[PDB]
Design a binder for this molecule. Structure first.
Ligand SMILES: CCCCCCCCCCCCCCCCCC(=O)OC[C@H](COP(=O)([O-])OCC(O)COP(=O)([O-])OC[C@@H](COC(=O)CCCCCCCCCCCCCCCCC)OC(=O)CCCCCCCCCCCCCCCCC)OC(=O)CCCCCCCCCCCCCCCCC
Ligand SMILES: NC(=O)c1ccc[n+]([C@@H]2O[C@H](COP(=O)([O-])OP(=O)(O)OC[C@H]3O[C@@H](n4cnc5c(N)ncnc54)[C@H](OP(=O)(O)O)[C@@H]3O)[C@@H](O)[C@H]2O)c1
Ligand code: SF4
Ligand code: SF4
Ligand code: SF4
Ligand SMILES: [Zn+2]
Lengths: 208, 90, 114, 376, 71, 57, 176, 94, 319, 111, 152
């Protein structure tokens, strides 16, 4: 359009269009939506039964290696009727390309863990257990990482209010370092910044 | 002096790139008042929004998803190898 | 209910699993009372455990009971070993915290409707 | 103590004299980071990426600003790219001074710590003259650099950077052909297989052992293609030849600085279209249209379109990735950080078995573990 | 009830006040219709605002400027 | 397989402390801060909780 | 591209082995190495003698807070509520009131000096150019009850100098 | 023969600066013993010397004297006694 | 007036003023007032450093420190001006080589029964002991009875407290025993006739006060603290060696802080179990603590692990 | 050569006939997958174009071009593990049609 | 008298002639302390030698940020220190916690665990306002142990 606006290219917008066309053509048991990101990236929606095989198809092949697990993460979403969102991410070292694996889930429904396929996701899966409560099945070592020994909230989800319940202190009443109910010395003001007029017309929701 | 060349028989010899810049060749200050221009389509009668449009670009274009002699095309052409950078590669 | 379970199937392997780990905790009360050098009476540590299991008996569903197992299974790693430095164990015994009124008229003198 | 100053409690069921089992405990500095960025705006939550490492200052915020420009469809202007390289390749002479000194202080050499930090204070001078402050500078923004650097810094970087290759010619005679330090570090912690890629490692503890790859000349950042340099590789797979990347990269960073002084175009700094950059102080004080975009760009933030993204730069020990889901309003949704220490330290339990206990303190220094970045 | 925190602490408080230090200004006169006040010097002080001075005759200290301004 | 169909009401417990029975939530549609006239602030059902004491420090 | 380091075999002949067997046995390294590189003590030490000498700084430095005022006083603040909306750490606490003359001012103004994360976001959000990060790191009080600042500390702390501050801002307002 | 080649400069430097009393009086506070080249003017009696441009960082040294506003004789120097004008000078800010 | 939860950082209405508050009895009181939260103005005599472990009790601006000699009037008339209650626990053991020890329990509780009384305070509280009797014992035990009598003239309603003998955590009473690793264990005086007293637990005496500090209507009604179950024997000294298995002083040592070859050997064995018509602890509810539960903790010598506790006492008789 | 580039691999030993065994080792397995899958339809195509370039031409270096694996020992390992994928590919059935559509509003991001 | 109060012109001078700091380098204020041991503003040999062991130290210096999982390990280490001990907190996170004052996993202030003497404010204080911090600590030592045993 002008300077200070990002120039795109149609090369990678056509190749990454054409490449992952046949990842839905040759495993149509699991893959249920594929969409191309406008900034030349790929997302591929996978039913949670296909957590191990579509990785295992990728893990070794001649046409799509994807041998580096960069980032396993997890997002929680109320109002979805299935809460969470597990997002895998991989790296084709032979090819310089990215693809993300977005598998939805719920709390009580377990997920078959990707420990045997990648040994990178040993610590990326003990962590998500602590922060949301997703129970990854048959994990070789499931423990308590990044939290204290007394938290029972799984705090990175939307039901845990920002400051905790267990604000700590010391007393000389015996020797110990003891807990207490939470007691702030300031309100933590909550500002309101969401301004009207619906500035974005392209992403507009259907009218209803 | 005798303490000068004793530093020249040991650990090479520099005498110019001393550690402290406390000696000369140290910059004192700067004089002038700075003036900074404003260039990229700041002016008028052509330079103009709705041609400048740094935002408002469409959603990610989805491909065929649910609800032919393809030659097994890779995501990209594979990485060609590198040189060995002739400065002193060994 | 179309979702696979964790360990149990229906009401019987679950309610023998919860009776299994109680025999672990009943054995591993009088060990930590000297393994941390904490000076109370040993019957206090057994009263807290038989208090704690009766709390959750309103469940009419499997794999919720199995979720509480995993928490109960995990604590025997830290407690039977030495990973809590005398202080994370003693938080179950609210010694410092003042007593709550829990009767109507004593709330009315102190506190705007807790 | 004397192992990251007061953190990293680890258990070692040592098999007689060898270790053969080692499982550390993190979470002694957790602070609640990713919970807390959900309650801020974009510009306001920027100085919690600067504190996410310790020692990289402008290398972080280089991978936050670049992960928000993608969502906005805005490129930075041309002078704003040759500033970011002159700093993003001067923090690679700070993260590599620390990894070659504090490693060699845990081992026990006294002076090259003191010999380099006496010289290092010529270079924390340069942050103060440009941004305003000592270490944590809130300088890079999602529309380029905040403000212009003063009259100077080109007769003072040039006096500095023409005399750094002698200071790096001292560590070669302290350490490389030294015998005792070579004996303390050869063939130790040889993890080299494709289990050293199945673990998902980023750079060095990769390329120092085999696989030649890095994201600076297989992907672009900036006007960063227009410089020329070579990427040092290692021969065998141990600590002494992933040490030698860090000595050799510091010589190659002088080449990318001396190539950067010649090329800076005069011009603007901020992104011009004013829905992202604030305007000048002499501009919001005469005209009318400038307050409405100075005021309202400080009560609420920008407005960024929805949709996820991911990126990666070459942080001077690994990567630094952001998975920044933005909903469509001034406060963002989840912001997941990828940093090293998840890869670089899950792969210690493989790396440590068979060797002594006094080999284990020799292992950890080469990964350049900086805590608060294990808060990924 | 509250005053015990500065027993032997000298209670350091402000000395000059600008609650009313406006009034010592020789309120400026022009003989015009509208005047600018980017008061305090250019590129510093409050932004430029145009005040109507026609009552019988004062301006109102610009809202920002504080200094009593008139004709 | 082992899909074990049944029906039992999903209720979870243990995570908060005592604020289950003490606090009644409130679901509402927010309605247009009337000093302006833009209607993007609507269109989302929210929830919000009770207010309690705020003394002075 | 590439570069290979530590990829070289030894010579392994009759000559150069004596060159290496003079190293291990009679120490042609480790004395020529570090009995000479260390001493080299004969440089002048660089120590700032702190109670008298002080170190260099720069005119954009960040530090203690202040509130300026105009020529003959007006308390340059106007309580426009922006320096409190972009503190990332929520330190500022402003409560205005219509003052009796008609121009609006503050009543209470509170800056914690512990939640202050030292951005420079108050310094640059202000339209009327009042609250300025002043260039003096003189601090170190002995009570947490003290580092909470009021309004009538900052003015006193902002009129202990303005010859210091106004020499700085006049040099540096031309960039921003 | 540098034992007298450069001590001849130091002989007038050490001895002939304030005699016998003016030398050890500054020696008992620190090893800051070099007489500076130039002088400052301000303010009380504390002539803030400025050196011969043969240093950097240690080229702007100050002296304190006695009891600014209720202090001891010489054995309490805290460093915050300076006037708020030398902050523009002592810190090399201009 | 109160507000909110009384966990920390609340207001709770009261503004105490606790004199002494450095020793074993005075310190442990202030800990329970640095919880419910209140302006506990604590003045101290001559100790800048020895009071430093008292500061993480008052939240932020709760407590405040002043210096005061005690004999001078206005140094104790400057802190008592803004107050609600004021309790007293000042005093010591043996006569010092500078003071006179006689009127220190007479004029000095009266020096803070001065214009302190006039200025508008209420609920002024003094302390007593269960053995302070005007019959001919002792130089310390009587002349405390002067403080029971000669200070009762002013403030005709106080609720002066009369606690029992205390065993605690950092005390001197029980700790005077088992510190007798020495050339012999000599009891007083090779007899077990009237041993033992009522060792009340120090958490109860500091819980009696804070239930009396807003009781209400407890003025003039003096109280006497019940001890444990129930009397005790000479078996105590055998019980101390059963589980044990055999501030601001100076720079190097204080050469005189002794074990007092004087009245102190018989300042504790004069028992005098006093009037059981005093109300005196259970009505100042609710607290009743034994000895055999809290006996493991404060007794601590070189075994440090192996206790194997089974030592007990029947009641003893006259229970 | 003695260095195989990537440390952890080894030059042992024979090129040009270690490969052509392992292609046709899989082609026997590749015939077994019940042919209506697109998996056979592509994987048969990628091995035949490979081996027609492979068998049988010097040098060792020329096989690296036109078949874009890495060095020759690693080109073995691209095909070595595709066998290990292939016998797993019979076990589960990717060629069968789709199972358990998500409940019609899950992949709609701006809420 | 003049005999006894003269003796605390030596002991209260011996106690301030050599402090031996423990430090808790936890977060970003560790590095901006290490530049003070770097020979520009050289910490040692202005009286105060650097880091030692927990049994031998006088005056500890808290830095960084105290979470929940470091709160007992601080107080245990504070116990082992001798009787003339002092606590300095540097950093703006041991003063009320920087930011992360509102997030769940931070002990909000580090005075809630130990009694701390000299507060030094600033995200990283510039090792220039920390020598001014410790030169406030030496000026704090004007106390005497004489006229305590000699008054009462
Ligand atoms: C006693 C301390 C007081 C004092 O010295 O005054 C302070 C005074 C400070 O004045 P300054 O201006 O700071 O000195 C700066 C000089 O430029 C700095 O002076 P310098 O560092 O250059 O030292 C000068 C001299 C000093 O070296 C010596 O000490 C001479 C050896 C001792 C002989 C007796 O060194 C030499 O070059 C003499 C070497 C003798 C030859 C050795 C045989 C080799 C011949 C074959 C080749 O320092 C000196 O006097 C310097 C001379 C020190 C002599 C050491 C005393 C030995 C007895
Ligand atoms: N109820 C009981 O069972 C019992 C048992 C024994 C003693 N007492 C007496 O009841 C109170 C309990 O005190 P305690 O157990 O904590 O022991 P304590 O050592 O007497 O502490 C009381 C405080 O009073 C201070 N003091 C002594 N003389 C003073 C004076 N002229 N002026 C100001 N302060 C003076 C003491 O030293 P400082 O001056 O340095 O502060 C001490 O800090 C004391 O009065 C004690 O004599 C009661
Ligand atoms: S300085 Fe500016 S932002 Fe701060 S109160 Fe005054 S007018 Fe408002
Ligand atoms: S420096 Fe930053 S955090 Fe501190 S008061 Fe100013 S705006 Fe707020
Ligand atoms: S807030 Fe201050 S103390 Fe905390 S990590 Fe950042 S710089 Fe260090
Ligand atoms: Zn004006």
């Amino acid at each position: 359009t002008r300077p200070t606006v990002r120039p795109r290219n149609d090369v990678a917008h056509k190749q990454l269009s054409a490449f992952g066309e046949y990842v839905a053509e040759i495993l149509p048991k699991y893959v249920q939506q594929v969409q191309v990101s406008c900034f030349n990236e790929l997302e591929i929606c996978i039913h949670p039964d296909g957590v191990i095989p579509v990785l295992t198809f990728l893990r070794d092949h001649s046409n799509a290696q994807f041998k580096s697990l960069a980032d396993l993460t997890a997002v929680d979403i109320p109002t979805r009727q299935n809460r969470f969102e597990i997002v895998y991410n991989l790296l084709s070292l032979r090819f310089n390309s990215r693809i993300r694996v977005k598998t939805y889930t719920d709390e009580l429904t377990p997920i078959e863990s990707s420990v045997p396929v990648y040994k990178a996701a040993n610590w990326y899966e003990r962590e998500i257990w602590d922060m949301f409560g997703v129970f990854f099945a048959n994990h070789p070592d499931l423990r308590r990482i990044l939290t204290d020994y007394g938290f029972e909230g799984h705090p990175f989800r939307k039901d845990f209010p920002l400051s905790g319940y267990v604000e700590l202190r010391y007393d000389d009443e015996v020797k110990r370092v003891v807990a207490e109910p939470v007691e702030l010395a300031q309100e933590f003001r909550k500002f309101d910044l969401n301004s009207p007029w619906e500035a974005f017309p392209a992403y507009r929701q259907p009218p209803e | 002096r005798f303490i000068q060349w004793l530093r020249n028989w040991a650990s090479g010899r520099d005498l110019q790139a001393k550690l402290q810049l406390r000696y000369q060749e140290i910059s004192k200050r700067t004089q002038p008042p700075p003036k900074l221009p404003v260039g990229p389509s700041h002016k008028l009668s052509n330079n103009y929004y709705c041609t400048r449009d740094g935002r408002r670009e469409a959603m990610p274009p989805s491909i065929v998803m649910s609800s032919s002699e393809k030659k097994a095309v890779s995501p990209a052409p594979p990485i060609k190898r590198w040189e060995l950078s002739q400065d002193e590669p060994y | 209910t179309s979702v696979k379970p964790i360990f149990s199937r229906d009401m019987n392997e679950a309610k023998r699993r919860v009776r299994e780990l109680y025999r672990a905790w009943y054995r591993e009360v009088p060990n930590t009372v000297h393994l941390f050098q904490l000076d109370i009476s040993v019957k206090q540590g057994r009263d807290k455990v038989r208090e704690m299991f009766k709390k959750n008996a309103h469940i009419t569903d499997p794999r919720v009971v199995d979720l509480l197992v995993i928490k109960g299974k995990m604590e025997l790693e830290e407690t039977i070993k030495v990973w809590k430095q005398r202080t994370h164990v003693m938080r179950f015994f609210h010694e410092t915290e003042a007593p709550r009124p829990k009767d109507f008229l004593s709330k009315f003198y102190v506190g705007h409707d807790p | 103590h004397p192992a990251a100053h007061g953190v990293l409690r680890l258990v070692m069921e040592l098999s007689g004299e060898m270790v053969r089992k080692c499982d550390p405990h993190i979470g002694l500095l957790h602070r609640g980071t990713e919970k807390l960025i959900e309650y801020k705006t974009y510009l306001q939550a920027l100085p919690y990426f600067d504190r996410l490492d310790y020692v990289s200052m402008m290398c972080n915020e280089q991978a936050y600003s670049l992960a928000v420009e993608k969502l906005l469809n805005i490129q930075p202007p041309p002078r704003a790219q040759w500033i970011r390289v002159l700093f993003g390749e001067i923090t690679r002479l700070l993260n590599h001074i620390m990894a070659v000194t504090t490693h060699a202080l845990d081992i026990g050499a006294m002076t090259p710590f003191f010999w380099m930090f006496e010289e290092r204070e010529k270079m924390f001078e340069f942050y103060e003259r440009v941004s305003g402050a000592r270490m944590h500078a809130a300088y890079v923004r999602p529309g380029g650099v905040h403000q212009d650097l003063p009259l100077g810094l080109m007769d003072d970087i040039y006096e500095f950077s023409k005399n750094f290759s002698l200071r790096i010619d001292e560590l070669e005679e302290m350490l490389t052909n030294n015998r005792i330090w070579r004996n303390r570090t050869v063939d130790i912690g040889i993890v080299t297989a494709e289990d050293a890629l199945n673990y998902g490692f980023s750079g060095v503890m990769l390329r120092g052992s085999g696989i030649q790859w890095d994201l600076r000349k297989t992907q672009p950042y900036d006007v960063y293609d227009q410089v020329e340099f070579d990427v040092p590789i290692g021969s065998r797979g141990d600590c002494y030849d992933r040490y030698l990347c860090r000595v050799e990269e510091m010589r190659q960073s002088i080449r990318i600085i001396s190539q950067c002084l010649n090329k800076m175009p005069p011009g603007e700094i901020k992104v011009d279209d004013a829905k992202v950059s604030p305007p000048k102080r002499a501009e919001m004080k005469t005209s009318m249209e400038s307050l409405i975009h100075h005021f309202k760009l400080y009560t609420e933030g920008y407005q960024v379109p929805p949709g996820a993204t991911y990126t990666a730069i070459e942080a001077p020990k690994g990567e630094f990735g952001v998975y920044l889901v933005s909903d469509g309003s001034s406060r963002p949704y989840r912001c997941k950080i990828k940093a090293p220490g998840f890869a670089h330290l899950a792969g210690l339990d493989k790396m440590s078995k068979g060797h002594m206990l006094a080999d284990v303190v020799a292992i950890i220094g080469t990964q350049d573990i900086v805590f608060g970045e294990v808060d990924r | 009830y509250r005053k015990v925190r500065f027993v032997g602490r000298q209670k350091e408080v402000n000395e000059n006040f600008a609650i009313d230090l406006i009034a010592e200004q020789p309120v400026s006169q022009v003989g015009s219709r509208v005047i600018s006040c980017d008061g305090g010097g250019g590129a510093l002080g409050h932004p430029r605002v145009y005040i109507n001075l026609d009552k019988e005759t004062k301006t109102g200290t610009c809202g920002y400027c504080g200094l009593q301004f008139r004709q | 397989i082992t899909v074990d169909e049944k029906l039992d009401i999903t209720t979870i417990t243990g995570v908060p402390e005592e604020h289950i029975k003490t606090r009644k939530a409130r679901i509402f549609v927010p309605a247009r801060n009337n000093m302006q006239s833009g209607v993007n602030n609507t269109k989302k059902w929210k929830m919000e909780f009770d207010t309690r004491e705020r003394w002075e420090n | 591209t590439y570069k290979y380091v530590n990829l070289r075999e030894p010579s392994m002949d009759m000559k150069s082995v004596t060159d290496r067997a003079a190293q291990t046995l009679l120490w042609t390294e480790l004395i020529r190495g570090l009995g000479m590189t260390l001493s080299y003590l004969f440089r002048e030490p660089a120590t700032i003698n702190y109670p008298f000498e002080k170190g260099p700084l720069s005119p954009r430095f960040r530090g203690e807070h202040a509130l300026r005022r105009y020529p003959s006083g007006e308390e340059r603040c106007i309580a426009c509520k922006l320096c409190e909306a972009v503190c990332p750490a929520q330190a500022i606490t402003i409560e205005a009131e219509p003052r009796a003359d008609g121009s609006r001012r503050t009543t209470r103004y509170d800056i914690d000096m512990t939640k202050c994360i030292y951005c420079g976001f108050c310094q640059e959000a202000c339209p009327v150019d009042a609250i300025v990060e002043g260039p003096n790191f003189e601090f170190s009080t002995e009570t947490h009850e003290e580092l909470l600042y009021n309004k009538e500390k900052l003015l006193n702390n902002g009129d202990k100098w303005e010859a210091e501050i106004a020499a700085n801002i006049q040099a540096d307002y031309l960039y921003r | 023969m540098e034992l007298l080649q450069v001590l001849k400069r130091g002989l007038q430097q050490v001895s002939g600066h304030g005699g016998l009393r003016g030398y050890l009086r500054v020696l008992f506070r620190a090893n800051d013993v070099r007489v500076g080249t130039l002088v400052g003017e301000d303010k009380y009696g504390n002539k803030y010397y400025e050196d011969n441009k043969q240093f950097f960082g240690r080229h702007r040294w100050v002296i304190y004297t006695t009891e600014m506003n209720g202090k001891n004789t010489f054995w309490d120097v805290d460093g915050s006694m300076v006037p708020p004008e030398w902050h523009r000078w002592l810190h090399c800010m201009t | 007036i109160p507000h909110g939860k009384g966990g920390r950082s609340s207001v709770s209405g009261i503004v105490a003023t606790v004199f002494g508050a450095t020793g074993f009895l005075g310190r442990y009181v202030v800990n329970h007032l640095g919880r419910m939260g209140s302006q506990v103005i604590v003045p101290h005599r001559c100790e800048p450093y020895d009071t430093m472990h008292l500061r993480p009790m008052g939240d932020l601006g709760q407590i405040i420190f002043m210096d005061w000699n005690g004999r001078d009037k206005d140094s104790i008339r400057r802190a008592v001006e803004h107050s609600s209650v004021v309790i007293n626990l000042v005093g010591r053991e043996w006569e010092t080589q500078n003071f006179d020890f006689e009127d220190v329990f007479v004029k000095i509780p009266q020096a803070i029964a001065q214009v302190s009384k006039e200025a508008g305070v209420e609920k002024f509280i003094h302390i007593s002991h269960l053995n302070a009797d005007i019959k001919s014992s002792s130089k310390y035990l009587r002349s405390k009875a002067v403080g029971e009598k000669e200070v009762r003239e002013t403030f005709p309603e106080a609720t002066i407290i009369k606690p029992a003998e205390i065993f605690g955590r950092e005390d001197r009473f029980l700790n005077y025993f088992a510190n007798i690793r020495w050339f012999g264990g000599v009891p007083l005086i090779s007899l077990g006739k009237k041993t033992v007293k009522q060792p009340v637990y120090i958490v109860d005496v500091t819980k009696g006060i804070i239930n009396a500090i807003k009781d209400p209507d407890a003025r003039g009604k003096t109280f006497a603290f019940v001890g444990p179950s129930r009397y005790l024997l000479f078996d105590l000294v055998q019980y101390v060696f059963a589980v044990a298995h055999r501030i601001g002083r100076l720079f190097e040592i204080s050469p005189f802080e002794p074990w007092t070859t004087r009245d102190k050997v018989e300042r504790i064995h004069t028992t005098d179990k006093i009037l059981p018509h005093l109300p005196g602890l259970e009505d100042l509810g609710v607290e009743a603590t034994p000895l055999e539960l809290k006996a493991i903790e404060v007794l601590r010598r070189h075994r440090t692990y192996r206790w194997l506790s089974s030592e007990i006492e029947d009641v003893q008789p006259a229970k | 050569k003695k260095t195989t580039g990537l440390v952890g691999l080894a030059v042992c030993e024979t090129p040009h006939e270690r490969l052509k065994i392992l292609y046709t080792k899989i082609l026997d397995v590749l015939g077994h997958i019940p042919k209506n899958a697109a998996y056979r339809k592509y994987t048969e195509q990628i091995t035949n174009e490979k081996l027609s370039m492979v068998k049988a031409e010097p040098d060792v270096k020329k096989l690296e071009e036109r078949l874009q694996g890495g060095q020759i020992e690693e080109v073995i390992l691209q095909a070595e593990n595709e066998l290990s994928l292939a016998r797993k590919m019979i076990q589960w059935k990717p060629w069968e049609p789709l199972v358990e559509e998500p409940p019609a509003s899950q992949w709609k991001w701006p809420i | 008298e003049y005999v006894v109060a003269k003796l605390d012109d030596l002991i209260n001078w011996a106690r301030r002639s050599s402090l031996w700091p423990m430090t808790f380098g936890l977060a970003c204020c560790a590095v901006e302390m290490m530049h003070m041991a770097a020979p520009r503003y050289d910490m040692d040999r202005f009286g105060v030698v650097f880091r030692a062991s927990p049994r031998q130290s006088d005056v500890m210096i808290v830095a960084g940020t105290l979470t929940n999982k470091m709160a007992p390990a601080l107080r245990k280490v504070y116990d082992q220190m001798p009787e003339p001990r002092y606590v300095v907190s540097m950093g703006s996170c041991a003063n009320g916690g920087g930011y992360y004052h509102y997030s769940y996993s931070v002990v909000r202030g580090c005075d809630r665990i130990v009694p701390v003497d000299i507060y030094v404010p600033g995200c990283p204080p510039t090792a220039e306002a920390l020598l001014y911090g410790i030169l406030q600590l030496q000026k704090k030592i004007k106390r005497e142990k004489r006229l305590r045993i000699w008054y009462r």
